[PDB]
Scaffold this active site. Structure first.
Site, mmCIF file in Angstrom:
data_model
loop_
_atom_site.group_PDB
_atom_site.id
_atom_site.type_symbol
_atom_site.label_atom_id
_atom_site.label_comp_id
_atom_site.label_asym_id
_atom_site.label_seq_id
_atom_site.Cartn_x
_atom_site.Cartn_y
_atom_site.Cartn_z
ATOM 1 N N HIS B 101 0.842 -1.199 0.000
ATOM 2 C CA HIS B 101 0.000 0.000 0.000
ATOM 3 C C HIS B 101 0.890 1.268 0.000
ATOM 4 O O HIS B 101 0.470 2.338 0.516
ATOM 5 C CB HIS B 101 -0.975 0.060 1.226
ATOM 6 C CG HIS B 101 -2.020 -1.069 1.283
ATOM 7 N ND1 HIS B 101 -3.278 -0.918 0.815
ATOM 8 C CD2 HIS B 101 -1.921 -2.377 1.739
ATOM 9 C CE1 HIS B 101 -3.954 -2.063 0.996
ATOM 10 N NE2 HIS B 101 -3.104 -2.962 1.562
ATOM 11 N N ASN B 174 -10.040 -2.850 2.960
ATOM 12 C CA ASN B 174 -9.822 -2.870 1.512
ATOM 13 C C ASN B 174 -11.151 -2.674 0.786
ATOM 14 O O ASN B 174 -12.180 -2.621 1.426
ATOM 15 C CB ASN B 174 -9.254 -4.245 1.070
ATOM 16 C CG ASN B 174 -7.745 -4.370 1.317
ATOM 17 O OD1 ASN B 174 -7.026 -3.358 1.642
ATOM 18 N ND2 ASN B 174 -7.240 -5.583 1.127
ATOM 19 N N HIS B 365 -3.214 1.159 11.944
ATOM 20 C CA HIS B 365 -2.934 -0.203 12.388
ATOM 21 C C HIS B 365 -4.177 -0.804 12.935
ATOM 22 O O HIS B 365 -4.752 -0.219 13.836
ATOM 23 C CB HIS B 365 -1.800 -0.164 13.465
ATOM 24 C CG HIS B 365 -1.461 -1.517 14.027
ATOM 25 N ND1 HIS B 365 -0.772 -2.468 13.326
ATOM 26 C CD2 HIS B 365 -1.718 -2.072 15.274
ATOM 27 C CE1 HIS B 365 -0.626 -3.586 14.141
ATOM 28 N NE2 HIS B 365 -1.210 -3.335 15.293
ATOM 29 N N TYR B 388 1.693 -4.187 12.214
ATOM 30 C CA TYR B 388 1.566 -2.777 12.057
ATOM 31 C C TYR B 388 2.269 -1.949 13.117
ATOM 32 O O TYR B 388 2.525 -0.772 12.850
ATOM 33 C CB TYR B 388 0.103 -2.321 11.856
ATOM 34 C CG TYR B 388 -0.630 -2.909 10.677
ATOM 35 C CD1 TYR B 388 -1.053 -2.102 9.650
ATOM 36 C CD2 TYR B 388 -1.052 -4.218 10.687
ATOM 37 C CE1 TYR B 388 -1.785 -2.591 8.563
ATOM 38 C CE2 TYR B 388 -1.778 -4.737 9.646
ATOM 39 C CZ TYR B 388 -2.155 -3.918 8.598
ATOM 40 O OH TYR B 388 -2.918 -4.409 7.590
#
Ligand code: HDD
Ligand code: HDD
EC number: 1.11.1.6
Lengths: 726, 726
Positions: B101, B174, B365, B388
């Site tokens: 990403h 997503n 995160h 994350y």
């Protein structure tokens, strides 16, 4: 076993043409290619076949498909050290990209000089025609990120690391002979201006935005390199078909201490060749990795990139003999005034094994010189010397970046420097200082000398006050851009006009476009008017009366500045699309391929689907790509053989394929009923220069096509293309 | 002063349509757009007007154009601290991009619930419809670098940082409702497979390569998300016109301690809309920043991206009521079985000031949850929780990344953690440990409770052995792909077919293509045969006889899985190209612009050159861009007014404009003599659905056009486009 039974997972470990085999790591593809640098990387190369999967600690892994959990639908446990090692390493894969030239493609090779240059330099790598020096070369754009596209309009980088017996020499050049700015102090300004604008980070890989043209309009020193960038120089066909230049005047120092001024050149032995803008732009979308791919594939095919090193040489007593300052990096040295003396040849003959380890981590820096070279006061070079050491501390993690394998010298290196992040060398010297008596002062300084001597700077005279001042001798901005313009053919001039016009159209603040047109009026009024017109701008009476700048030392043109003025075409390694039908005439195809093979030209066989088609005589033709999947953008010419032409005559993609190639001035050849495709591109019955046509694909049908390919594009076609809706 | 006299350098601080003004940092463009987070950044915003240029140490700079040198042609001096500071900061500008990403575009906004959710969650931000929570949203692709193109075929990321009164909650989702893989242990394998291949680092931003399809062919669990990526879901028109999903089942926890299973959804109030592949790919070349540009410009125009947050809620007792596992992130929950409850709305209403400081440095995160929410045992979620936090230590330089302004909570934060690189907070607490008496134990633990209480995990029962084992309930791979396939329109089905066909054509190793075709035959024979046919593969009898997978809890389709089955077009914020001529019928233009304005639709005036043209009645029409500079790829419809059509009738670019738009299924409207353009696109005299035509641009002409624009694209046109060479 997951590999197929027939072994077709594994690329043939021998030269193959583009697309014939999957690409592979260089030492698996060409195990027999070697040089001294590639040999020395052997200690860090890791294989894989027949080894167990392990942690980084050497623990064999039993299940690399699951986390450790309390029950098979339960929570993951912290004690899963195999999971955390593997995710931790993934989580920290990335390192910062290069501030500039982040996007780039690299290959190993070697260099050899033609003869000893010891009369003009004591540089060891130039001392003996038998002495071969391994190299690693990285080519790049400037502006875009590592994940940006190749065929943007931009300057290109051409960086060469020579692993000499007397140290690393990095020649860090571009593909134009000047830079945009005069003093390094302005680099972050210029680079901030060309880079994506800071509010929104747009545009990527493009100078077509307000801040870049703002800067240029306010800093006329940038106009020379802007002219190059706006020409077709800004869109090379391949890293194989562009020139390289060190830009700065440096010095050669011979064994008597005599200094000669030098500018460095790389001549592409495959000749000079650029795309056209619409092609280059579309190609950033159809294949953003086109130059990277083309480079890797040339090497896998044995079309090794070859370049000739050349030197322009100016005696010290000639420093002031020209109309411009030799230390001014916005000024070129015309080849008409100082010819390029040929020095040696470089051949890039092996791809890396791992792109990250070898290419991304390579550190090039123009301060890396060797005895027999030295710098000058070029104030842009001068500031470069600080930056390329500095930047590695963050980019490569600390001061031991020379121990990253691709960066290591192959010659000895010993000194008193110690520690730093990820220190590899374990020094056994009882001393870490000099002078010392406890190790008898080793390693020891070496006096300068004819060979194998210590580095001493040339004792140039310095005289003047401590000033932040530009030399008045640098304050002339138009004459070089004008020489460049006048040296271009009329079609190259058209392309320059259209580069400025398209880029300036994307500038949202109209006054910026006007200020740039005003600057062009100072260079050439023909150029300025043609751009003005495409922008709806009218020149004032004042602008129409600006006296053009003087010529450069009497020259009103230098045709070495043009890509195409002097043909230097090479067809070897170029590619032709052959558009197939479901009943191809095999006699046409045999003749095409036979003539292409003889000249080293590759072919891709295209159809409307993958799989195979069978020719009239039963021959099975494997299809490389579809019309849509391998567009004309990616080839140098298109041939359509006879067969069942009806099969593709109403295919939009096949028709369009020809229109796009036609528009981008590529040779097109049509045999027998493939002559029906003349209607789609509106060719007269009696034909036209640049369209090859005949009943069948020989006699001289392939010679004519191959002759058009040697000329690269059909420039005479240019007035015909505005008609076509493509 | 260098600005122009008329002040046209500065954009108006009022909403304006795309292209009307230069874009600007958000706090200069929309100074009166405020929310708590935006206000809290005021301590770190730095202005510029009327301030002196200084070093970072506050020393005023006299000459920012020159290095210090001994003589104005002499060497640069080490004592130039101004130069070295400036070049040092430049040399270290870059930080590692995100591992995945890396390419993304971000905006500020706010969220507000529709009603109190305290019956099902104690989350404070969901407690009262008058609670306004600032948000920062970053949309992204997955594979490509920070410098890659926006309109690639990829999954898109949709990450929202909620700055709540009880903590930051990051909802890290997503644009499809499942992921490719089941267990986080396999994420480095999947990601290495999809990313550019390690030998040569090709290709960028594309799944269309051997290693990706190799992995997919060997890991059928991927097939469900693969189907979504191969559909037009993989190519959204805009971040404004796609769905978002959290993918995992999480838990809501209420004040009584009751847990409810939840999946999160974002529903775009602008409706769902995607490009077609040829347009998308070409757009990566014509404007690789298209999605970033369009997001920034929507917000500048006042077309705020709006999304409704939605929850699918499943009681704890219903955990096992479906024929897939709720904890399997490759399975979706069909809305036919569990509807989405609409719970609040998020509005993105202000762009960042500085992309690097706010967007590039933002850290999201999914482990950042707040009291009222909790995790489940989803083995992909479980592994994310580690990654994350870990990844920010290199990417953001250390453990204080929460002190980076964009990442700071707006609520209090106090604890005993100390030091770390670039520590900003200066702690005054006598104690840096608890329990302590020397500061009376402050800051203190807080028991969990209905509001403002400390975090306590939901006391889920765990029973099982320590095993690395996939749950057998996850071992089903085909029925969700099938349900997705059967739920698409016939035209969405053809684009899925074309998606696999195009991608697999670029896989060099043919056995990989075959193995993928074999997987499709376990999903649906129609699909598998149509892709086989494009690849020149024949299914065997065995493959023809594979039984299809069972329905999902009795469902044979769910129209909520399609982008287009249920009409939900909204034309506000879309854009039309108006193709000009040198004597436009002004009455046509008045009518067009008036009707567009009424619907919130933008227009760009296009011509063969920049500057202006003058209308028949003498109105001066400013040109936004050329035909070549703003291609039809960038617009939703094309309109051509009457006038002196002869002027553009034979312009190849203008003709191509209409061909391209026609091929990509866009509405085209043609008034008066504009209908001469019917010939370029092969339109029969008595018209065709999707081409609006009339003697002039009356009220009915615009209504028809805007009706088509509401249906997004003219799907009925698909059989006509095969014919068109464009
Ligand atoms: C004062 C700063 C400065 C100035 C004036 C220049 N550059 Fe530079 N250049 C850098 C600072 C720098 C850098 C920040 O140090 C880079 C980026 C990352 C790196 O390792 O070096 C760099 C990288 C870089 C690369 C990429 C090397 C590689 O592939 O890794 C090339 C080819 C050049 N430069 C070439 C030039 C030429 C021909 C210049 C003008 C004659 C020039 N640079 C001016
Ligand atoms: C085990 C590792 C792992 C797994 C299984 C996932 N991710 Fe992830 N994701 C990361 C590890 C990661 C990361 C390495 O930690 C990133 C990269 C950079 C960063 O700050 O976080 C990341 C970034 C990242 C971003 C960009 C956030 C931003 O814009 O900064 C989004 C939207 C997602 N991920 C979404 C997902 C979704 C919806 C997943 C599956 C349901 C998923 N990730 C699985």
């Amino acid at each position: 076993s997951l590999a197929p039974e027939d072994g077709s997972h594994r690329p043939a470990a021998e030269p193959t043409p583009p697309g014939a085999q999957p690409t592979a790591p260089g030492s698996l593809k060409a195990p027999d290619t070697r040089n001294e640098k590639l040999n020395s990387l052997e200690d860090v190369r890791k294989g894989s076949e027949n080894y167990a999967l392990t942690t980084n600690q050497g623990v064999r892994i039993a299940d690399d498909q699951n986390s450790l959990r309390a029950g098979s639908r339960g929570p993951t446990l912290l004690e899963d050290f195999i999971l955390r090692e593997k995710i931790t390493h993934f989580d920290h894969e990335r390192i910062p990209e290069r501030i500039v030239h982040a996007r780039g493609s690299a290959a190993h090779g070697y260099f050899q000089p033609y003869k000893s240059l010891s009369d003009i330099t004591k540089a060891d790598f130039l001392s003996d025609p038998n002495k071969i020096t391994p190299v690693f070369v990285r080519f790049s754009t400037v502006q875009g990120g590592a994940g940006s596209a190749d065929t943007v309009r931009d300057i290109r980088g051409f960086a060469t690391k020579f692993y000499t017996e007397e140290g690393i020499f990095d020649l860090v050049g571009n593909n134009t002979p000047i830079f945009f700015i005069q003093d390094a102090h302005k680099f972050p300004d210029f680079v901030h201006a060309v880079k994506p604008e800071p509010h929104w980070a747009i545009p990527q890989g493009q100078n077509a935005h307000d801040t870049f043209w703002d800067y240029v309009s306010l800093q006329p020193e940038t106009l020379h390199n802007v002219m190059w960038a706006m020409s077709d120089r800004g869109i090379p066909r391949s890293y194989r078909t562009m020139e390289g230049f060190g830009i700065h005047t440096f010095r050669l120092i011979n064994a008597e201490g005599k200094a000669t001024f030098v500018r460095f050149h790389w001549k592409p032995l495959a000749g000079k060749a650029s795309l056209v803008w619409d092609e280059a732009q579309k190609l950033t979308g159809r294949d953003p990795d086109f130059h990277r791919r083309e480079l890797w594939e040339a090497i896998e095919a044995g079309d090794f990139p070859e370049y000739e090193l050349g030197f322009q040489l100016i005696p010290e007593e000639d420093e002031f003999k020209f109309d411009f300052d030799l230390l001014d990096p916005t000024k070129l040295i015309p080849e008409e005034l100082v010819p390029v003396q040929r020095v040696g040849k470089m051949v890039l003959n092996r791809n890396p094994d791992n792109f990250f380890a070898e290419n991304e981590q390579a550190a090039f820096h123009p301060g890396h010189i060797v005895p027999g070279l030295d710098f000058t006061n070029d104030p842009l070079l001068q500031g470069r010397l600080f930056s390329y050491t500095d930047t590695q501390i963050s980019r490569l993690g600390g001061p031991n970046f020379h121990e990253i394998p691709i960066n290591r010298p192959t010659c000895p290196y010993h000194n008193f420097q110690r520690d730093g992040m990820h220190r590899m060398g374990i020094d056994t010297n009882p001393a870490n200082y000099e002078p010392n008596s406890i190790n008898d002062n080793w390693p020891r300084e070496t006096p300068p000398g004819p060979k194998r001597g210590g580095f001493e700077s040339y004792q140039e005279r310095v005289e003047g006050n401590k000033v932040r001042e530009r030399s008045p001798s640098f304050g002339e901005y138009y004459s070089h851009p004008r020489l460049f313009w006048l040296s271009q053919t009329p079609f190259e001039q058209r392309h320059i006009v259209d580069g400025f016009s398209f880029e300036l159209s994307k500038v949202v603040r109209p006054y910026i476009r006007e200020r740039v047109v005003d600057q062009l009026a100072h260079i050439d009024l023909t150029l300025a008017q043609a751009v003005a017109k495409n922008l709806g701008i009218e020149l004032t009476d004042d602008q129409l009366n600006i006296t053009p700048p003087p010529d450069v030392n009497g020259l009103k043109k230098d045709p070495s500045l043009s890509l195409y003025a002097i043909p230097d075409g090479d067809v070897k390694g170029r590619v032709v699309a052959i558009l197939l039908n479901d009943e191809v005439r095999s006699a046409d195809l045999l003749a095409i391929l036979k003539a292409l093979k003889a000249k080293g030209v590759h072919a891709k066989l295209l159809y409307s689907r993958m799989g195979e088609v069978t020719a009239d005589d039963g021959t099975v033709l494997p299809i490389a790509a579809t019309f849509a999947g391998a567009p004309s953008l990616t080839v140098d010419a298109v041939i359509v053989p006879c067969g069942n032409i009806a099969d593709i005559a109403d295919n939009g993609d096949a028709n369009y394929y020809l229109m796009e190639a036609y528009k981008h001035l590529k040779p097109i050849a049509l045999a027998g009923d493939a002559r029906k495709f003349k209607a789609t591109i509106k060719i007269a019955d009696q034909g036209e220069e640049g369209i090859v046509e005949a009943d069948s694909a020989d006699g001289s049908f392939m010679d004519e096509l191959l002759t058009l390919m040697a000329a690269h594009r059909v420039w005479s076609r240019i007035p015909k293309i505005d008609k076509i809706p493509a």
